[PDB]
Write a protein that binds this ligand. Structure first.
Ligand code: CA
Ligand code: CA
Ligand code: CA
Ligand code: CA
Ligand code: CA
Ligand code: CA
Length: 76
DNA sequence: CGTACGTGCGTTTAAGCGGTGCTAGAGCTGTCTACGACCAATTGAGCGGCCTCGGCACCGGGATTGTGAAAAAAAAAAGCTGCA
């Protein structure tokens, strides 16, 4: 298997559609070829929690925990 | 009382001196990655409390033995001796 910032790239990159990108449609695609452990959902929200704050991923619209994201940082 | 160990002497030996040459290896740098801290999540091994019952303390008594101490027997010591 590959890492979870390896997995988060594959869903949003391949197709590009529902709610810009959001939490359910990412986890549906991700499970098909990561091969699911129980920790999948726990370390997929953690991967998002540190990727949104670093600059690799930037968020479109939300409040606190919920929302929707993109890949290209804002103004870049 | 006997001699082992200090003292002082001459003979012998090699430590110490410095110098020189040759180099193992101490020690430093740069490159990459396996590995350990450090997250959040799952969870069962070990914690505190508490209950039972057999190990062990305790007694006791009476037999045994190990451990002396006294008194009694042997040997040796000291004083006499007399003798070839
Ligand atoms: Ca579970
Ligand atoms: Ca206990
Ligand atoms: Ca209890
Ligand atoms: Ca018991
Ligand atoms: Ca018993
Ligand atoms: Ca007794």
């Amino acid at each position: 298997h590959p890492k979870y910032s390896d997995m988060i790239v594959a869903a949003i990159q391949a197709e590009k559609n529902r709610a810009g990108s959001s939490r359910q449609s990412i986890q549906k695609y991700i499970k098909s070829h990561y091969k699911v452990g129980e920790n999948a959902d726990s370390q997929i929200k953690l991967s998002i929690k540190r990727l949104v704050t670093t600059g690799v991923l930037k968020q479109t619209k939300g409040v606190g925990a919920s929302g929707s994201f993109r890949l290209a940082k804002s103004d870049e």
